[PDB]
Amino acid sequence: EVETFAFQAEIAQLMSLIINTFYSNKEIFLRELISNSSDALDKIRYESLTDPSKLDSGKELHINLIPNKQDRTLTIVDTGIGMTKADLINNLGTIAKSGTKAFMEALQAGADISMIGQFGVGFYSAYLVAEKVTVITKHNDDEQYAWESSAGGSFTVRTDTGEPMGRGTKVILHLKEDQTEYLEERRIKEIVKKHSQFIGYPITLFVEK
Numbered sequence: 001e002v003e004t005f006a007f008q009a010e011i012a013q014l015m016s017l018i019i020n021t022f023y024s025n026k027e028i029f030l031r032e033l034i035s036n037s038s039d040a041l042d043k044i045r046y047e048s049l050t051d052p053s054k055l056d057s058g059k060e061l062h063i064n065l066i067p068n069k070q071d072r073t074l075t076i077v078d079t080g081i082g083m084t085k086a087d088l089i090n091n092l093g094t095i096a097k098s099g100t101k102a103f104m105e106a107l108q109a110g111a112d113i114s115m116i117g118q119f120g121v122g123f124y125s126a127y128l129v130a131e132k133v134t135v136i137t138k139h140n141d142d143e144q145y146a147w148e149s150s151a152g153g154s155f156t157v158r159t160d161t162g163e164p165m166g167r168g169t170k171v172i173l174h175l176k177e178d179q180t181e182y183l184e185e186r187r188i189k190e191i192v193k194k195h196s197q198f199i200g201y202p203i204t205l206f207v208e209k
């Protein structure tokens, strides 16, 4: 079954601002999502030091970038801690509420959209380039879930019926028609080198056959 939820008022406001504001420096979405993945990887790595059985769901700690020109999708796969049903519906939304408020106040005070990460709401920069975002996730303590939103004030959460992941998160960016440059090998390499060169996990770009 598919459950539909309204985003927190502040989050819905941020999403509308990200989608409607004229801002050409859209490439920052990739460093924001890579940073989210890197943070999830740090979390599982740290937890595994006191409980090694937390890595029974996969020992490899990495990030994979998968562009798909046919489907017009850019997929970011990590083997991080993953997210529970509570994280997707309540927890992360509650955490994001305060940062979203602070970021929108900062934007009114002179700050630019690239500073989104300093407020811990960088995930939402995915909407600079994507018309729809699908998040497939698996945490050791819960089932595999699929979160999805095309903005408009709502998101859906369902138990994922697809291919089992083991542990981690897949962020599927259903790109806007004019944002296909982020599917080009050369462009992705340039973004990773400029903004994510010092990420402490291997970042593998999957080249299209």
Ligand SMILES: CC(C)Nc1cc(-n2c3c(c4c2CC(C)(C)CC4=O)CCN(C)C3)cc2c1C(=O)NCC2
Pocket: 033, 036, 037, 039, 040, 078, 080, 081, 082, 083, 087, 088, 089, 092, 093, 095, 096, 120, 121, 122, 123, 135, 147, 168, 169, 171
């Ligand atoms: C284990 C938490 C910290 N990893 C993540 C958390 C988010 N994330 C975050 C936020 C949100 C999301 C994803 C979302 C779909 C739940 C929406 C949201 O508000 C707000 C606060 N941010 C600090 C993080 C996104 C991702 C991840 C992840 O594991 N991999 C990549 C995608």
